[PDB]
């Protein structure tokens, strides 16, 4: 034989046996999340750490293999997989230190706690009640008192253990060859060996900033809107042409304004669309629920579901005694089977979550018979966005019409469409000029440029600056503002959600395209359209085998992320936010401070 | 390749790298594998009379 062979046969080999030990271990995790006990935890730890010392030793076992003499472009890939993901460069005692500085930010994170002031009789957790104040609750001064209490437990305490977690992944960049932790994140989206596609991890920040620029006017103007909507209910607490509070945005993090469409609703009189009382007076169950997505999977051209996967995942709760974890979830366990796991109710939400799950157990289902190392999509985002856009084309009124839920006397006119283009806004864009700050701050913290004794500094002039937020409350060095985050606290990438929205954006838009169809964007559907849904295959099938430019360009004809499609769906969105603020100023003004 | 009428089982070391692999090592693998029928099991792990 040859170096190839050897190759393909341990790759084969591996792929086999990874297969039956990760759906062991993922079989036990699911034994233990619709059964927590005692039994099946120990089983869960056991299976994930026989699956991480079987990733360990073949990562190892792989480093034999050269990557200079493969001509596959498949088995390389692959094998520098291998290499580099179960296989550690790091010392013993700093992978250890790293590993405890993790549990204990997990742990931190997770039961964090602040209570009322002289009062320490009682307390609640983040999750139980700050959550709802924040959502609820129209007080300024408690909430103002509220989030400067959280930032300051957290904050404080997280400082020392934020900054030895990131010497430590600065170390293990230092030991590795990209630039800095920062780089080795950008480096997921590097596609390298191809003439014609070849990618940079530095472009990515260029390309951010590129189409942050370009959405500027429409998140500032939104920014207008919602600020001259406030000055009617917070005058003296918001300044009429300065920053917003940041403890106003409906929540702790400020990451969404949904929570303050109620509030600052443009037009509470139109009628809106309540499918969740027809669906209580015509009896829609989970059961009805789930049927209906399968039906809806069915006419886009998506093969249904199976009886494995209907007998694989959970609908209902059993309760009583058993108690299992109601956060939404797919399950992708391999060998054919995949799960839902989710507490469903009878609300829109529920359906979109339904929608979202089933989009994205169908994505899982695209690669079945693709090698176990190609089971997984080239960019982070596209999962996401495969997810969303089902959801996306279930929640225009067009199927809710056509399924009967919808009054068929129901009309669309400019203030309901503008209304639901404003909801979906501050659903969406709410958080990608955030998110593009925060990416851009981890991205710094990583590689080192800002200053260790600055960072808080920073901090608020990014915040000061781009965000357009002022700070009610300042914070210096002792506090930890950004670690009171889930992203930051589990050092997970802050980027996917914005490549997330253009990918979905795009792939709706060239769907609709696609399916032929009339009027506004925003009110387009793809149930009888199975041209898009072949479109849609084309990429589903292609995994990691392909690299995500040439996917994107099979679907949508572009070789890069544009946020032109996102702001042609929101172009009346545009035009009525720019009628609105002709009398209210646009920008924010750093000098102006609220703490005098 | 087979040959009609066969009863090959064995779970002998095979011949997988171009080394003449007649004990063990790296890149030295069995043909024969265990299937695991489960009822579970869809597509590719079924059993069939
Ligand atoms: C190299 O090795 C690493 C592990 O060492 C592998 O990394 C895993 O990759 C998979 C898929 O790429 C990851 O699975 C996804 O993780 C996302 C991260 O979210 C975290 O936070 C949420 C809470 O917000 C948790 O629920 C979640 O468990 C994660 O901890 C999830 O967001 C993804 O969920 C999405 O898809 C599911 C369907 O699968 C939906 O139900 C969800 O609603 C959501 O849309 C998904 O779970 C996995 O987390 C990674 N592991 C780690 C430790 O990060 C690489 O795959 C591997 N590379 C190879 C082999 O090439
Ligand atoms: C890179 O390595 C992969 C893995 O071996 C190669 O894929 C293999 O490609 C051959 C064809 O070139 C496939 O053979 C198939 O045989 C059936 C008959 O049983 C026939 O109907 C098919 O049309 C096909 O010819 C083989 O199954 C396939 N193996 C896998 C695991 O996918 C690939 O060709 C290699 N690439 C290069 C450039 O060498
Ligand atoms: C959960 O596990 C226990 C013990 O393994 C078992 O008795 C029980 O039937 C399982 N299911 C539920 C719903 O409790
Ligand atoms: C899937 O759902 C049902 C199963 O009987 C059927 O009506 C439908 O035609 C099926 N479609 C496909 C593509 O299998
Ligand atoms: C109202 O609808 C008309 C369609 O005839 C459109 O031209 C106009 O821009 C809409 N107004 C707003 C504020 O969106």
Redesign the interface.
């Known amino acids: 034989s040859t170096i190839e062979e050897q190759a393909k046969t341990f790759l084969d080999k591996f792929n086999h046996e990874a297969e039956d030990l990760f759906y062991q271990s993922s079989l036990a995790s699911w034994n233990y999340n619709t059964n927590i006990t005692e039994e099946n935890v120990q089983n869960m730890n056991n299976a994930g750490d026989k699956w991480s010392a079987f990733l360990k030793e073949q990562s190892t076992l792989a480093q034999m293999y050269p990557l200079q003499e493969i001509q596959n472009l498949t088995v390389k890939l692959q094998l520098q997989a291998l290499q580099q993901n179960g296989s550690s460069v790091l010392s013993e005692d700093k992978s250890k230190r790293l590993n405890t500085i993790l549990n204990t930010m997990s742990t931190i994170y997770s039961t964090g706690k602040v209570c009322n002031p002289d009062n320490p009789q009682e307390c609640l957790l983040l999750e139980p009640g700050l959550n709802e104040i924040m959502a609820n609750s129209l007080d300024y001064n408690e909430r103002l008192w509220a989030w400067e209490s959280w930032r300051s437990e957290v904050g404080k305490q997280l400082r020392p253990l934020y900054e030895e977690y990131v010497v430590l992944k600065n170390e293990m960049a230092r030991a590795n060859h990209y630039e800095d932790y920062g780089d080795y994140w950008r480096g997921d989206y590097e596609v390298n060996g191809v003439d014609g596609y070849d990618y940079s991890r530095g472009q990515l920040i260029e390309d951010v900033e590129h189409t942050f620029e370009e959405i500027k006017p429409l998140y500032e103007h939104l920014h207008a809107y919602v600020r001259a909507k406030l000055m009617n209910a917070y005058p003296s607490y918001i300044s009429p042409i300065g920053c917003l509070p940041a403890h106003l945005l409906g929540d702790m993090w400020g990451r969404f304004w949904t929570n303050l469409y109620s509030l600052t609703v443009p037009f509470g009189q139109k009628p809106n669309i309540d499918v969740t009382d027809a669906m209580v007076d015509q009896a829609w169950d989970a059961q009805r629920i789930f049927k209906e997505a399968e039906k809806f999977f069915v006419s886009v051209g998506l093969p249904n579901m199976t009886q494995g996967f209907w007998e694989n995942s959970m609908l209902t709760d059993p309760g009583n005694v058993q108690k299992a974890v109601c956060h939404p979830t797919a399950w992708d366990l391999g060998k054919g089977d995949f799960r839902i796991l989710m507490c469903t109710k009878v609300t829109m939400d529920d359906f979109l979550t339904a929608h979202h799950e089933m989009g994205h157990i169908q994505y899982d289902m695209a690669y079945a018979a693709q090698p176990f190392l190609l089971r997984n999509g080239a960019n982070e985002g596209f999962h996401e966005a495969v997810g969303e856009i089902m959801s996306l084309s279930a929640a225009t009124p067009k199927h809710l019409k056509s399924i009967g839920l919808l009054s068929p006397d129901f009309q669309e006119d400019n203030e309901t469409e503008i209304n639901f283009l404003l909801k979906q806004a501050l659903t969406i864009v709410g958080t990608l000029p955030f998110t593009y700050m925060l990416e851009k701050w981890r991205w710094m913290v990583f590689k080192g440029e800002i200053p260790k004794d600055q960072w808080m500094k920073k901090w608020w002039e990014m915040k000061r600056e781009i965000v357009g937020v002022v700070e009610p409350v300042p914070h210096d060095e002792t506090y930890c503002d950004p670690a009171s985050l889930f992203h930051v606290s589990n050092d997970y990438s802050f980027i996917r959600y914005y490549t997330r929205t253009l990918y979905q954006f795009q792939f709706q838009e060239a769907l609709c395209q696609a399916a032929k169809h009339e009027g506004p964007l925003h009110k387009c559907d793809i149930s009888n359209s199975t041209e898009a849904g072949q479109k849609l295959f084309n990429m589903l099938r292609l995994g990691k085998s392909e690299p995500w430019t040439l996917a994107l360009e099979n679907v949508v004809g572009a070789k890069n992320m544009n946020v032109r499609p996102l702001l042609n769906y929101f172009e009346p969105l545009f035009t009525w936010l720019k009628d609105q603020n002709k009398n209210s100023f646009v920008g924010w003004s750093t000098d102006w401070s609220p703490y005098a | 390749k087979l040959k009609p009428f066969e009863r090959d089982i064995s779970t002998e070391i095979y011949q ?3 080394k003449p692999c007649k004990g063990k090592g ?2 030295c ?1 069995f043909p024969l ?1 265990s299937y ?1 029928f489960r009822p ?6 079924q059993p069939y009379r």
């Open positions: 997988a790298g171009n790296p890149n693998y594998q695991g579970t099991y869809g597509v590719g792990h």
